[PDB]
Design an enzyme around this catalytic site. Structure first.
Site, PDB file in Angstrom:
ATOM      1  N   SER A  94       4.725  -0.737   7.889  1.00 44.93           N
ATOM      2  CA  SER A  94       4.337  -1.316   6.437  1.00 44.93           C
ATOM      3  C   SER A  94       2.456  -2.192   6.348  1.00 44.93           C
ATOM      4  O   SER A  94       1.627  -1.223   6.591  1.00 44.93           O
ATOM      5  CB  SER A  94       5.581  -2.065   6.456  1.00 44.93           C
ATOM      6  N   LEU A  95       2.825  -3.308   7.043  1.00 40.53           N
ATOM      7  CA  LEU A  95       0.721  -4.380   6.710  1.00 40.53           C
ATOM      8  C   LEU A  95       0.730  -3.467   7.840  1.00 40.53           C
ATOM      9  O   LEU A  95      -0.816  -2.927   8.431  1.00 40.53           O
ATOM     10  CB  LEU A  95       1.378  -6.060   7.008  1.00 40.53           C
ATOM     11  N   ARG A 119      -2.080  -7.461  -0.631  1.00 44.08           N
ATOM     12  CA  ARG A 119      -1.062  -6.824  -0.801  1.00 44.08           C
ATOM     13  C   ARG A 119      -0.177  -8.368  -0.588  1.00 44.08           C
ATOM     14  O   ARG A 119       0.989  -8.090  -1.688  1.00 44.08           O
ATOM     15  CB  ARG A 119      -0.437  -5.449   0.526  1.00 44.08           C
ATOM     16  N   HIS A 203       9.599  -3.693  -0.282  1.00 46.39           N
ATOM     17  CA  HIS A 203      10.632  -2.148  -0.091  1.00 46.39           C
ATOM     18  C   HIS A 203      11.467  -1.986  -0.991  1.00 46.39           C
ATOM     19  O   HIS A 203      12.591  -1.036  -0.394  1.00 46.39           O
ATOM     20  CB  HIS A 203      10.511  -1.721   1.475  1.00 46.39           C
TER      21      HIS A 203
END
Ligand SMILES: [Cl-]
Length: 314
Positions: A94-95, A119, A203
């Site tokens: 993810s990140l 983000r 998500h």
């Protein structure tokens, strides 16, 4: 055979991460200095001294975890690592996709810090407080969890947020539906089913406002094709086209992190050693559950950096 570098995501942050490395190497110290400058903030003070709950806020944890990973990369590079020569693929959770892309030269360090702050801010703000949740499940396969998502659809949206391997699946969506899904998972015999009732619904489709924010941010940033391919969370294939990579980063915000499939793909396509670059041993724990034959190694300390350079033949 070959090596892949993997980059950890939210949940790998720890107070004091990176501090010793900054004391030992100017290359590490300068990464934190630049990240602070890029964000116009002494983020490093939160990284090194907490409080933990402040560091854990996603607007902090995302650029902070990337900084720790990039400090490790820069130290390795000063000690002779050529990524393009020694690393077959990069991937991150993810990140961690942003950390991976920075390590592969796609974005500058200053831009990666700013993208991750955008983000984290956009994700924290996407849904009103109390509206979303997540849950951590162990022991049910993807098919069975997808069925639970369908079972609770009348109560609201529930989706698979992470497929992590080792029978670990994280779900996400609207609070009531996710709560019910935990009840159902427990009834079906999940080994673990734990509600995270105040989590942002990462998500899931509820993250759409954050996806839109990332689309706008990624459109303006300077970007270059990565020097080795990224195995993207959404596609689980080697990606090197910067325009497509931007699209996949946007899609990633609302979609499933396909981590199990990522490690399985990497292990089957010419890699026998998976390095976890940065803070903690979370991805290494997953890799060992997914594939018992691969060598999985953490790279967060000076000692581990030395060991990784030897394994890579630097
Ligand atoms: Cl966390």
């Amino acid at each position: 055979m070959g090596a892949a570098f993997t980059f950890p995501g939210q949940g790998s942050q720890l107070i004091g991460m990176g501090k010793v490395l900054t004391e030992q190497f100017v290359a590490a110290r300068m990464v934190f200095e630049e990240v602070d400058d890029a964000l116009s903030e002494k983020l490093s003070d939160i990284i090194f001294e907490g409080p933990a709950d402040v560091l854990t806020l996603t607007a902090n944890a995302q650029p902070a975890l990337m900084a720790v990973s990039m400090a490790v990369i820069r130290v390795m590079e000063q000690l002779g690592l050529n990524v393009e020569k020694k690393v077959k693929f990069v991937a991150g959770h993810s990140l961690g996709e942003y950390s991976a892309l920075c390590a592969a030269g796609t974005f500058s360090l200053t831009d990666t810090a700013r993208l991750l702050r955008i983000r984290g801010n956009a994700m924290q703000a996407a849904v009103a407080v109390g509206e979303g949740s997540m849950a951590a499940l162990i022991g049910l396969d993807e098919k069975d969890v997808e069925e639970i998502c369908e079972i609770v659809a009348e109560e609201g949206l529930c989706q698979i947020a992470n497929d992590n391997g080792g029978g670990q699946i994280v779900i996400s969506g609207e609070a009531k539906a996710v709560e019910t899904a935990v009840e159902v998972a427990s009834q079906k015999g999940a080994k673990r089913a734990v509600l995270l009732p105040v989590s942002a619904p990462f998500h899931s489709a509820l993250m759409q406002p954050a996806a839109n924010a990332m689309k706008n941010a990624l459109l303006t940033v300077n970007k270059t094709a990565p020097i080795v391919p990224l195995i993207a969370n959404v596609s689980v294939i080697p990606e090197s086209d910067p325009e497509r990579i931007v699209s996949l980063l946007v899609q990633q915000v609302t979609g499933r992190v396909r981590w199990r499939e990522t490690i399985e793909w990497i292990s089957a396509n010419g890699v026998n050693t998976l390095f976890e670059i940065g803070s903690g041993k979370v991805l290494t724990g997953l890799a060992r559950r997914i594939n018992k034959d691969i060598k999985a190694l953490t790279v967060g300390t000076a000692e581990e950096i030395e060991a990784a350079l030897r394994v890579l033949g630097v």
